[PDB]
Design a protein around this ligand. Structure first.
Ligand SMILES: Nc1nc2c(ncn2[C@@H]2O[C@H](COP(=O)(O)OP(=O)(O)NP(=O)(O)O)[C@@H](O)[C@H]2O)c(=O)[nH]1
Ligand SMILES: OC[C@H]1O[C@H](O)[C@H](O)[C@@H](O)[C@@H]1O
Ligand SMILES: OC[C@H]1O[C@H](O)[C@H](O)[C@@H](O)[C@@H]1O
Ligand SMILES: OC[C@H]1O[C@H](O)[C@H](O)[C@@H](O)[C@@H]1O
Ligand SMILES: [Mg+2]
Lengths: 173, 339
C-alpha cells in the first residue's frame, strides 16, 4: 500500500507467443490454456519488494495483432522496462525479435531496460528455436535472456523481478 | 425502405446491407466461438465466467475501435470506458446485460464521442434481438446515457438527473476500466465517497446490512428460490462490505471479483480462513449453477428448486450471522469502551 517507485513495464511480441499468459501467471499465479487475443492494450498492477522498497509494477500487455501497432508503439516512450517475448515452438516469432528490437531502438526511451523471453519452454517436443540460439541473439544485443513457461510456471517470477532489479539499479545511481 | 448500415437502428432498418451483414455475423461468430471455447476447455483453472468476461471485454473493445474507424472519429486519449454490474466483477453469464459508461476529461469530447456510442448501442441492441445477449439497458448503465466529465456524472447523482441515485452510485463504485485509463474513474468515485449526503449509503455497515436485511433468506416451506436474490446478491454485498472495511483496491479492478477480494483477504489475513473458504465455496457453487441455468435457457433464468439450493442457502445463513457480528464490531469499534 506504501509505494517507493512506480515501474511502467511493457510486454511486446508476435500474437500467440504468450504475453497475456506470462502476465496472468505473474499477476494471478494461474495458466489459461485458451487463446483470447488481446485488443489494443491491457494492464495489470502488482506491487513487489526489492531492497526493502515497495515497487508498484504497472504492466502494459500489448496486442501482437499488426492492426494495433500504431496504438502499441505510442507506449514504448513511457516504458521503463520492456519484455520481448517469442515462442520457442515458432521460428517465425524468434526471427521477428530483431524487428521488435529495432522498433524499441526507434520509439523507446534511450536508457530503457530490455529482456528477451523465450516462452512455452515446457513444449520441448515442438521446439523450433534451440535455447543457445536465443542466448546467442540476446548476447549479440547485450540484452538479458530467459526461457519462460506460463504453463509450467518456469522463470516467470524471476524474469519480472530481474527486469525490475535492472530498472531499480539504473535509477538508484 | 432501404438497407441499414452496421450502426443503423434495427426498428428503422430491419435488414443490413450485404457489407454490414458480413460484419454483424463476424461479431455473432466471436460470441459463439467464445461460448464454444468455454465448453471445450471444461475443468480449466480459469472459471467459465472469468473466461467469458475476458473474451467479451476483447470483443467489446474491438467493436469500439471498429466504430471509431467506421464513423471517421478519432478516439480521445483522455476518454475512459468502464464496465459496471456482473461484468465489472467478472461474474456475468453469457445472457447477462452489457453495462458500460464513458468518462471524458473535457465536456466538448461528449459532442465528438456520443455519436460513436449511440452507433454502438444500435449494434448491441441488434445483437440482443438476435441472440438475447449484451443487452444495452436504455434506462440503465449504457455509454450513451452515462457519458461526461467526473463533475457531470457526480452532478447527475447529487441532483435528480437520474432515477435510483443509489443503484447508479453502486454501478460507478463497482466499475472496472476497459482501457488502461482509470484516473477519471478514481476522481468520480472519490467525489461520490466525499459527498456528505451519500455518507452512509457508501459505508461498509450499509453493504453488510443489505446482505443481512434487504436480500433476506427464502420464506419457510418455499419450493422455488433465486440463485440471484437469495445467494449471489447477499455474497456480492458481503464482499463490498469487506472491500470497504479493509480499503481493498486495484487500479485494474482486480479487487472487484470474488476471487480478487478472497486473494486479498488471504494475503493480509484480514478474515479467518474458515470464513473466507465458506464465501469462496458458495460463490463457486452459485456461479456454476447460475452460468449453467442461463446457458441452458439462453436467457436470465435464476429460479431453481429449494432442494437443489439447500446446501448453499445454509452456508449463506452462516455468512449472514458473520455479517451481523461485523456490523456490531464496527459499531463497537467507533465507541471504543476502555477499562
Ligand atoms: N504450452 C504453453 N502454452 C502457452 C504458454 N503461454 C501461453 N500459451 C498458450 O499460447 C496461446 C496464446 O497465449 P496468449 O497469452 O493469449 O498470447 P499473446 O501473446 O497474449 N497473444 P496476443 O498478442 O494475440 O494477445 C494460448 O493458447 C495459451 O494457452 C506457455 O508457457 N506454454
Ligand atoms: O530454465 C530452465 C529451463 O531450460 C529449458 O528452457 C527447458 O526447456 C525448461 O523446461 C527448463 O525449466
Ligand atoms: O453483480 C452486480 C452487483 O453489483 C453491485 O453489488 C450492485 O449493488 C448489485 O446490482 C449486484 O450485487
Ligand atoms: O476503498 C476500496 C473501495 O473503494 C471504492 O468503494 C471502490 O468502488 C471499491 O470497489 C473498493 O473496494
Ligand atoms: Mg494477449
Amino acid at each position: 500500500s506504501h509505494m517507493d517507485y512506480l515501474f511502467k513495464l511493457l510486454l511486446i511480441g508476435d500474437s500467440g507467443v504468450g504475453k497475456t499468459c506470462v502476465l496472468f501467471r505473474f499477476s494471478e499465479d494461474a495458466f489459461n490454456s485458451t487463446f483470447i487475443s488481446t485488443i489494443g492494450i491491457d494492464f495489470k498492477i502488482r506491487t513487489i519488494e526489492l531492497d526493502g522498497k515497495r515497487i508498484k509494477l504497472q504492466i502494459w500487455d500489448t496486442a501482437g495483432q499488426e492492426r494495433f501497432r500504431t496504438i502499441t508503439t505510442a507506449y514504448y516512450r513511457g516504458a521503463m522496462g520492456i519484455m520481448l517475448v517469442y515462442d520457442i515452438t515458432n521460428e517465425k516469432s524468434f526471427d521477428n525479435i530483431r524487428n521488435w528490437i529495432r522498433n524499441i531502438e526507434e520509439h523507446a526511451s534511450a536508457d530503457v531496460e530490455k529482456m528477451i523471453l523465450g516462452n512455452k519452454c515446457d513444449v520441448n517436443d515442438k521446439r523450433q528455436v534451440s535455447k543457445e540460439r536465443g542466448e546467442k541473439l540476446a548476447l549479440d544485443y547485450g540484452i538479458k535472456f530467459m526461457e519462460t513457461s506460463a504453463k509450467a510456471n518456469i522463470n516467470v517470477e524471476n524474469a519480472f523481478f530481474t527486469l525490475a532489479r535492472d530498472i531499480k539499479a539504473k535509477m538508484d545511481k | 425502405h432501404m438497407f441499414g448500415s452496421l450502426y443503423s437502428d434495427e426498428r428503422d432498418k430491419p435488414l443490413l446491407s450485404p457489407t454490414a451483414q458480413k460484419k454483424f455475423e463476424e461479431y455473432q461468430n466471436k460470441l459463439a466461438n467464445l461460448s464454444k471455447i468455454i465448453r471445450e476447455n471444461e475443468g480449466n483453472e480459469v472459471s467459465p465466467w472469468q473466461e467469458w468476461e475476458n473474451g467479451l471485454r476483447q470483443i467489446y473493445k474491438e467493436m469500439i475501435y471498429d466504430a471509431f474507424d467506421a464513423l471517421g472519429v478519432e478516439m480521445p486519449k483522455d476518454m475512459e470506458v468502464h464496465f459496471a454490474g456482473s461484468l465489472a466483477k467478472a461474474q456475468a453469464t453469457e445472457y447477462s446485460d452489457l453495462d458500460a459508461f464513458v468518462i471524458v476529461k473535457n465536456d466538448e469530447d461528449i459532442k465528438k464521442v456520443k455519436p460513436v456510442f449511440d452507433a454502438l448501442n444500435n449494434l448491441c441492441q441488434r445483437i440482443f434481438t438476435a441472440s438475447n445477449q449484451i443487452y444495452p439497458d436504455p434506462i440503465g448503465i449504457n455509454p450513451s446515457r452515462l457519458i461526461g466529465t467526473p463533475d457531470d456524472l457526480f452532478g447527475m447523482l447529487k441532483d435528480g438527473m437520474v432515477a435510483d441515485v443509489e443503484a447508479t452510485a453502486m454501478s460507478i463504485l463497482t466499475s472496472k476500466p476497459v482501457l488502461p485509463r482509470y484516473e477519471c474513474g478514481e476522481e468520480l468515485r472519490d467525489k461520490i465517497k466525499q459527498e456528505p449526503s451519500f455518507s452512509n449509503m457508501v459505508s461498509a455497515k450499509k453493504f453488510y446490512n443489505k446482505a443481512i436485511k434487504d436480500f433476506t433468506a427464502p420464506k419457510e416451506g418455499a419450493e422455488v428460490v433465486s440463485v440471484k436474490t437469495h445467494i449471489m446478491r447477499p455474497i456480492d454485498f458481503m464482499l463490498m462490505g469487506l472491500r470497504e472495511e479493509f480499503n481493498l483496491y486495484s487500479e485494474d479492478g482486480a479487487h472487484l471479483s470474488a476471487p480478487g477480494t478472497i486473494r486479498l483477504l488471504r494475503e493480509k489475513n484480514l478474515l479467518p480462513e474458515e470464513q473466507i473458504a465458506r464465501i469462496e465455496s458458495v460463490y463457486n457453487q452459485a456461479m456454476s449453477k447460475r452460468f449453467e441455468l442461463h446457458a441452458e435457457h439462453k436467457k436470465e433464468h435464476d429460479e431453481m428448486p429449494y432442494s437443489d439450493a439447500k446446501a448453499m442457502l445454509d452456508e449463506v445463513a452462516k455468512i449472514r450471522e458473520l455479517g451481523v457480528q461485523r456490523v456490531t464490531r464496527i459499531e463497537n469499534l467507533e465507541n471504543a469502551k476502555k477499562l
